[PDB]
Design a binder for this molecule. Structure first.
Ligand code: NA
Ligand code: NA
Length: 101
């Protein structure tokens, strides 16, 4: 089955572009097979950007990716879990996780 692979080490342009020009203070990238994930933390919000150049991203994929970040990467204690926002477009899913701090 499909595992999330941290690919940050070979996305150093993108990591730095996002750190220097955005409110993000953490930027990481991951593969989920041929699906690409960008994960960030900034004051007041974490973000996941999930996209797939070839195909629509499937619902079970979304669920596996989301629950991986929630379990491993996101401090749920500061997240506003009733205020999650998920924007679904054609080949792009955007999940916002507001935070107290
Ligand atoms: Na920044
Ligand atoms: Na963020």
């Amino acid at each position: 089955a499909m595992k999330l692979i941290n690919t940050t080490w070979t996305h150093q342009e993108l990591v730095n572009n996002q750190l220097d020009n955005t409110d993000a203070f953490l930027v990481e990238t991951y593969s989920a097979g041929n699906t690409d994930v960008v994960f960030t933390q900034a004051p007041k919000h974490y973000e996941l950007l999930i996209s797939n150049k070839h195909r629509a991203v499937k619902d079970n994929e979304l669920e596996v990716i989301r629950e991986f970040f929630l379990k491993r990467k996101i401090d749920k204690d500061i997240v506003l879990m009733d205020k999650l926002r998920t924007v679904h477009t054609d080949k792009l899913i955007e999940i916002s996780f507001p935070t107290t701090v």
